[PDB]
Short mmCIF file of C-alpha atoms in Angstrom, two decimals:
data_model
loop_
_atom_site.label_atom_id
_atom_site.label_comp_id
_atom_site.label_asym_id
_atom_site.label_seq_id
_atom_site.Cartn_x
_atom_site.Cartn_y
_atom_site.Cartn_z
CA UNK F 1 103.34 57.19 60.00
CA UNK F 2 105.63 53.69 59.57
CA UNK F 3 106.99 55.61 56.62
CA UNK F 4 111.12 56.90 56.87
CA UNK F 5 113.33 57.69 54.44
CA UNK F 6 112.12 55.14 51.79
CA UNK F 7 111.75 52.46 54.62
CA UNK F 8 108.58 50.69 56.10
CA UNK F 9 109.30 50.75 59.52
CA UNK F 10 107.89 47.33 60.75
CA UNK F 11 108.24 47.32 64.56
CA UNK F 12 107.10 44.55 67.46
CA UNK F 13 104.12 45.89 69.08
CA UNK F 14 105.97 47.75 72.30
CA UNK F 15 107.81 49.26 70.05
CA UNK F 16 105.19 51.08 68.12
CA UNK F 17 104.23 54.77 69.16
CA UNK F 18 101.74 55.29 71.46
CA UNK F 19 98.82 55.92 69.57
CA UNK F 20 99.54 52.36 67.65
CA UNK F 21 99.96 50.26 71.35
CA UNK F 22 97.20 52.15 73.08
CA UNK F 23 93.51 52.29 71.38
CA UNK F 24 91.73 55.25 70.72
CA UNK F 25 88.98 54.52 73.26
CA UNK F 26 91.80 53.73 75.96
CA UNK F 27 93.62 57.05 75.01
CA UNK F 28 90.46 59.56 74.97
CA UNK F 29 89.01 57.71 78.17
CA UNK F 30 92.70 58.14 79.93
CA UNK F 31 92.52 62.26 78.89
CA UNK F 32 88.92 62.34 79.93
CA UNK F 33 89.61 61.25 83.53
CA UNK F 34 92.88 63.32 83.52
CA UNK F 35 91.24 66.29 82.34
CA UNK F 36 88.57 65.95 85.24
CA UNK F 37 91.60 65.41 88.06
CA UNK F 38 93.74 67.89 86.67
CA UNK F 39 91.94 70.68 84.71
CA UNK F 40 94.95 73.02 85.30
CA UNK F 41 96.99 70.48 83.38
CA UNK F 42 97.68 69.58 79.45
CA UNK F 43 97.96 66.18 78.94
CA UNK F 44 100.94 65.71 76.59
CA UNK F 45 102.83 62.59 74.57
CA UNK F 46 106.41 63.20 73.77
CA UNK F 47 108.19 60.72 71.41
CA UNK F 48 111.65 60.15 69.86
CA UNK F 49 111.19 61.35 66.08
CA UNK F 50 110.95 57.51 64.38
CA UNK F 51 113.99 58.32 62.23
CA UNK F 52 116.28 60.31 65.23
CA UNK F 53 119.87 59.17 64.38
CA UNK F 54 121.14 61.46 67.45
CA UNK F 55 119.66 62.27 70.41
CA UNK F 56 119.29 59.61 73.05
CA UNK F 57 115.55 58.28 74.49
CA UNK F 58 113.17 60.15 76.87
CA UNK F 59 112.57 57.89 79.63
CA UNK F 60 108.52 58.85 80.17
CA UNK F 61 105.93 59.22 76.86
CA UNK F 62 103.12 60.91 79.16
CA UNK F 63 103.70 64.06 80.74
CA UNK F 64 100.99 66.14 82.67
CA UNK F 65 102.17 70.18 81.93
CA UNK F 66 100.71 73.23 83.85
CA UNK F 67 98.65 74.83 81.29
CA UNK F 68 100.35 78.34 81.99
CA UNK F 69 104.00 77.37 81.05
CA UNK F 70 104.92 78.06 77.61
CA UNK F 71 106.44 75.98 74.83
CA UNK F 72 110.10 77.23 75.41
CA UNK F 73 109.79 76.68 78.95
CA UNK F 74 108.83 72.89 77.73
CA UNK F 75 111.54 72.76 75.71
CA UNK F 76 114.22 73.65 78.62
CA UNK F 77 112.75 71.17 80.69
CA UNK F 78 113.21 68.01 78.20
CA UNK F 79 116.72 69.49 76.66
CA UNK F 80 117.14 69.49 81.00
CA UNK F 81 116.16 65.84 81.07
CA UNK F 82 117.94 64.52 78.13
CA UNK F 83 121.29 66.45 79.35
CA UNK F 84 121.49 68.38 76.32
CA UNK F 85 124.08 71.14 75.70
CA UNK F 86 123.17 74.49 74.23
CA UNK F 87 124.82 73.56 71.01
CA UNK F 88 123.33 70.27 70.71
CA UNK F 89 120.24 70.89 67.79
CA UNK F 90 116.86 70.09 69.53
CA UNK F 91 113.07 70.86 68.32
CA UNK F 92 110.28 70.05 70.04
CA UNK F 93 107.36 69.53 66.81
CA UNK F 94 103.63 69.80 67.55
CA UNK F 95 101.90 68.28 64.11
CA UNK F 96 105.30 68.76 62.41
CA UNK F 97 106.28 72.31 63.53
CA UNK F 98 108.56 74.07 65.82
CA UNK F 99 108.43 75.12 69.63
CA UNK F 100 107.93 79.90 71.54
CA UNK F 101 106.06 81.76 74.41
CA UNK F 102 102.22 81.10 73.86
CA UNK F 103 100.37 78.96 76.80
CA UNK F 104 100.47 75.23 76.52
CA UNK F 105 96.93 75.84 77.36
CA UNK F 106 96.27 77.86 74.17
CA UNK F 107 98.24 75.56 72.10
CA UNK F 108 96.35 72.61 73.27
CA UNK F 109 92.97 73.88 72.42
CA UNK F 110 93.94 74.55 69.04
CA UNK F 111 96.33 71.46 68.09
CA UNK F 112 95.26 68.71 70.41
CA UNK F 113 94.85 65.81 68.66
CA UNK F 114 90.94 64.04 68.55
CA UNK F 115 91.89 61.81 71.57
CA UNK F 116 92.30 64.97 73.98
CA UNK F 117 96.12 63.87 74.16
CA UNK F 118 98.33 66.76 72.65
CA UNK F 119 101.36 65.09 70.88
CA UNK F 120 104.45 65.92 70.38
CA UNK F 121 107.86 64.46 68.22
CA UNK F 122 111.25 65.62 69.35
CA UNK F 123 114.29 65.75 66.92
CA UNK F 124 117.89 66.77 66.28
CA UNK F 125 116.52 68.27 62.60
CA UNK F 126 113.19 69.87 61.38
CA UNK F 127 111.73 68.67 59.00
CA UNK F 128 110.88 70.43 55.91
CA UNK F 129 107.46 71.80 54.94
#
């Protein structure tokens, strides 16, 4: 949502997430075609939380995942990427929650959003719920 802390995030068009620059018939098209190439894969979106104060910005959104790794293994690989210490507070959030050892490829079936694209928000903090 555009909604942080009180605020109304108002942002230039690039700079909105990706389901607000891409439409939903250009997202589940891109998915369906990826799917067909790629059936071992999960098609995944990783953002910067909108109201991350701390960690620095992923440079890629789209990410194609072999559907056998698991969620911590994920995890590892972007703390990798953003040069993260093991100190350094990092959760990866499907639909608000925290990433675990179950299959990308099981998570996907049962979280993936109606576009066929799985998202995903990454933060220094959970958030409460």
């Amino acid at each position: 949502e555009d909604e942080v802390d009180g605020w109304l995030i108002i942002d230039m068009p690039s700079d909105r997430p990706f389901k607000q620059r891409r439409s939903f018939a250009d997202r589940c098209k891109e998915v369906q075609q990826i799917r067909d190439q790629h059936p071992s894969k999960i098609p995944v979106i990783i953002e910067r939380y909108k109201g991350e104060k701390q960690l620095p910005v992923l440079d890629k959104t789209k990410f194609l995942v072999p559907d056998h790794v698991n969620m911590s293994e994920l995890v590892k690989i972007i703390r990798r990427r953003l040069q993260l210490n093991p100190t350094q507070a990092f959760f990866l959030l499907v639909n608000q929650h925290s990433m675990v050892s179950t299959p990308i490829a099981d998570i996907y079936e049962q979280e993936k959003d109606e576009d066929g694209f799985l998202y995903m928000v990454y933060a220094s903090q959970e958030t409460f719920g």
